[PDB]
Amino acid sequence: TIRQNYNETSEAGVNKQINLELYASYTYLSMAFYFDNTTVALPGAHKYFKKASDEEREHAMLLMKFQNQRGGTIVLQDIKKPENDSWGSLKDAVQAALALEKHVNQSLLDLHKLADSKGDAQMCDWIETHFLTEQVEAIKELGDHITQLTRVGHGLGEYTYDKENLG
Amino acid sequence: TIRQNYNETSEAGVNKQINLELYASYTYLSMAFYFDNTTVALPGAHKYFKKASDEEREHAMLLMKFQNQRGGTIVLQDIKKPENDSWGSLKDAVQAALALEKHVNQSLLDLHKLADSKGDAQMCDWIETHFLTEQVEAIKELGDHITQLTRVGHGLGEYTYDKENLG
Amino acid sequence: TIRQNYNETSEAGVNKQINLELYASYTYLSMAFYFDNTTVALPGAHKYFKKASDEEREHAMLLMKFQNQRGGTIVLQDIKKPENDSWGSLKDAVQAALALEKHVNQSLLDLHKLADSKGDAQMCDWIETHFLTEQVEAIKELGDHITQLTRVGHGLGEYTYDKENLG
Amino acid sequence: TIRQNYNETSEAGVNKQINLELYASYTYLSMAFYFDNTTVALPGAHKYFKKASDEEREHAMLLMKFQNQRGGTIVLQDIKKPENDSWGSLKDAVQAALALEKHVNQSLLDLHKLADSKGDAQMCDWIETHFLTEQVEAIKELGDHITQLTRVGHGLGEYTYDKENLG
Amino acid sequence: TIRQNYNETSEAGVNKQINLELYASYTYLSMAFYFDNTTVALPGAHKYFKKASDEEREHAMLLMKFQNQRGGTIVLQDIKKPENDSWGSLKDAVQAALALEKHVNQSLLDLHKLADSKGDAQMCDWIETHFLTEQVEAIKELGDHITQLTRVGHGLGEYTYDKENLG
Amino acid sequence: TIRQNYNETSEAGVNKQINLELYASYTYLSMAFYFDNTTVALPGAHKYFKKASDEEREHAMLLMKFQNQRGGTIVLQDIKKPENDSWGSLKDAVQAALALEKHVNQSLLDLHKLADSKGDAQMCDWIETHFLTEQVEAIKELGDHITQLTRVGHGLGEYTYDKENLG
Amino acid sequence: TIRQNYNETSEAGVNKQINLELYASYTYLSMAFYFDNTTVALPGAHKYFKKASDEEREHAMLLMKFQNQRGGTIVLQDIKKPENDSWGSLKDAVQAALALEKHVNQSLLDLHKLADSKGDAQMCDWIETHFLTEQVEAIKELGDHITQLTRVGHGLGEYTYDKENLG
């Protein structure tokens, strides 16, 4: 028995975060291949969101590793399809990514608060180490992208930012 | 308009195959982290199924790329959770992998047959090039693993094969 | 006598594809030096279409090699001059290239269907191997160029796409 | 059970091809050492036919591998001795090699047709990938050798072609 | 005329040895691909017997070379199919290889004795140089393999010896 | 006293062989400088026979070394001048070389037989090791040269073979 | 059972040669450390005979390997102490080594004759390959050493030959 100081509600919270990270990965994968569609044809955004999909899947596997490390049991659920089939302009998609990352951030903060309420000092630090600052940096990056995409405007500016910044 | 000689039924079969490859990726991910659970503790199998999960996800993205190349539209669905939460012995899991890969193979053969019935010569060759021989090779490899896992037996043999062959 | 399983109608189809590939090469050569004219002065497009002209001539020589390999006889015809003397905007020329490549694709698919109706298994696979996927990729690329050229607009955007993408 | 979409008549056809490839290997071995006989003494042809014998044995082993990959059973038969004990002039031998490769080509085309009639998409593609174009190229090469051997004539020409081309 | 001190019964004996070496090569090929069958799945034995098949074919070609060197005439016969279609356990197969190599050894000793009775000093030395010690060493190696296969036992031991020693 | 199991008749046969190897060396030297005469002017043959002369002289010194190793006494005789002053065509000379090498071979076989009749096991193996297979190989090479020189014919062929093969 | 064409008297002869080679090794070891004694102090001879002792032990192990290779049974006997405790002058010791090597040579020739009388063609060639010429060369070398040691004389010459030749 390796389980120690690991509450069953914390364990359920981890399984729930695993699903949410997979959901984000699937959403960024949808975004990536939307921008690869010939009627959209923004290759920098295709690369940017494909990499984001890879990273979210890595986040899910980190949480699965943690579940096993602490002596919990991974329980998987359906990965719901993304909210949209097509994602509009480049700015629209980055705005949707900002909304999603803020939703993931709030879910991570609630998980941290739950672990903390149960005295799980190692879990709290683990969440801080691998997730909380990474989320803050991703959110700041997405916000900057939105401000710049507003600045460059439609048409030539969207092509330029796609190629020079996202790609 | 880039679409040419690409039938709407073939397009729907590609969207179906995308979902099935993702379902396989999720099943192998479940298997991989089952073998990482401390009550199982087979590290070679963890590595082997994690890599299979990566590959199936790559198969899904190849089909997504093909959907776009031919002028179709990707439509994603929920990725159903895997059939089991735990996978038994190493041989049980390899047997479950074999059954899944044969299900995937029949789905690909059916997709090929449909494309062929619509005169889609490029789609048929594409499926042959990227999937049909790869599937034959994976099934032969899984069959051989099952025969060897029967030969080495329970206990020390399972440890040895996990470490010396799968890992 | 090396000729085996090679129908006289297949042979005539190959001679006809040889002429069409040469016609495409001549058309891209016209496009390339139109963009080199001082009243147009788009050097990226000059390079892009010069390379496309080289590749179409390579396609014709592949078919001539195949004709000889199967024991047919090459019969050449006049290479008709291109449909236009000047090609308009950059987007107009890429649209004309998309139309031409789709016409070449349909001609290749008809050639494949003819060979298949005569049981010429090697010819069908040869056409798949060297032409059918290459055509699909060229058509997707041209479509993406058109979507991007629409996005960047007239003037500065056409200069930019010419230099940063086509060149 | 790995066997899937693999018809028993296809399996018997593969076993027949294995014997024919081994028969071809044995014939080229006979040719090779005929040319090593001191009353013949053509060292370039010795090397050329010895290599052809090696390759035909590789073809046999590819088909044995394929038989196992698809879940069939290899059944071997006698390898019949070659049709002749001595092979005449260099041109005579290359002419006999051409006749044999066309016989093997027809056998491969009949095997492909049989597989296609049973809907074995992977087998057809495997035969195309490993044998059909390979066979077209070998027949063209043998045809060209016969034309050149006719051109160079008896005596000095035969010595020269043996040394400068076959060797 | 290069023939010197080369008896016609020696020449017929060399032709007989050529067929026996080719028969041995064919038997080891059968063994090799029996072990590649998915119901057997012993990859080390596949590689070990494939190499033995190559070497026996080299032995055949050495004797063909010798026949030509001495001014004899090579006369080939059918290569009879191997005695079995399947070869049992790894130990069974190595035991059958030992029986075959002892049969080949006795044939070589009878060939040496025949040559010696005709005063063919060079032939006797050639057989000693290329075959007799080579054969003693192969028999000793096969004997040691059988003893070790008995020692390691069924199951895990067979897997281990196949992988660590034969492979 | 080092002499052991070395019969006086074997010793006299070694002294006889020493003289015959020297006679061969002198014959090939004559041939070599015949082909260097300006009325013949075949430089490849000059090089080829000069090297054969060097080798035969090395054979004589090996036998001299062996005479001393076994405790015999070297006794030298006149080296008789070669049978001819001029050697005709390139084929004539190679034919004369073949006859001489077969005479040398019979002399070596007779020497082996004598040693064997005296129980000199080491001398027999020594003759086998240094001479009997070397002689078989030289005779086969000379036979092949004669066959090729017949194939290439007079004039241009003789020039070509001299330069491309002998030189 | 690996034993084939290996007579029980041959086997007994091999066991007997094993003992004789060990006896020679022990004798050269005695010689080597005699010359290392401070009242003798010939360091070149110490090295020379130490190496000879190593080689004779290697000869014994070759014969033990051969016994096992042919399926005999090694049976060891006492290694008798050397005939002398001290070996006189340097020339006296080399004379004793010559006598011993001639005794070993005669024993090897008798072993060869016995094997030959039983038709053991491989054994005869093995003895020739590893022993008979090596013995002839060692005997010639020892004889030369004795002639030179006579030439250089007592005192300074013995010191010089010891250092410049044996060491």
Residue numbers in the entry:
A (entry chain B), B (entry chain H), C (entry chain B), D (entry chain A), E (entry chain A), F (entry chain H), ...: 3 to 169
Reproduce, without paraphrasing, sentences from the article in which this PDB structure was first reported:
Ferritin is the main iron storage protein in most living organisms, playing a key role in iron homeostasis and detoxification. Canonical ferritin is composed of 24 subunits, which self-assemble into a quasi-spherical nanocage with an outer diameter of ~12 nm and an interior diameter of ~8 nm. Ferritin has prominent octahedral 4-3-2 symmetry, and each ferritin molecule contains 24 C3–C4 interfaces, 12 C2 interfaces, 8 C3 interfaces, and 6 C4 interfaces, which provide several potential pathways for metal ions and small organic molecules to diffuse into its inner cavity. Thereafter, we introduced a self-assembling strategy by designing π–π stacking interactions at the shared protein interfaces involved in two different kinds of 3D protein nanocage superlattices, which is referred to as key protein interface redesign (KPIR).
Upon analysis of the crystal structure of AfFer, we deemed Pro156 an ideal position for anchoring the His motif, because the side chain of Pro156 located on the exterior of the C4 interface that protrudes on the outside surface of the protein cage. Subsequently, Pro156 was replaced with His, termed P156HAfFer. Upon screening the solution conditions, similar platelet-like crystals were formed with P156HAfFer at the low concentration (2.0 µM), which is six-fold lower than that required for the growth of above crystals, in a solution containing 10–20% alcohol and 200 mM MgCl2 at pH 8.0, suggestive of a self-assembly process. On the basis of the peak positions of the 1D SAXS curves, the unit cell parameters were derived as a = b = 11.98 nm and c = 20.74 nm, confirming that the protein nanocages are assembled in a BCT pattern. To elucidate the protein assembly behavior at the atomic level, we obtained P156HAfFer flaky crystals and solved its crystal structure at a 2.10 Å resolution. As expected, the P156HAfFer nanocages were arranged in a BCT fashion in the crystals. The designed His motifs of P156HAfFer form four pairs of π–π stacking forces in a face-to-face configuration along at the C4 interfaces, whereas the inherent Pro156 residues in native AfFer stabilize the BCT arrangement through weak van der Waals forces. The crystal structure revealed that the imidazole ring distance of the pairing His–His is 4.01 Å or 3.74 Å. Collectively, these findings demonstrate that P156HAfFer nanocages have the ability to self-assemble into a BCT lattice in both solution and crystals through the designed His-mediated π–π stacking interactions at the C4 interfaces.
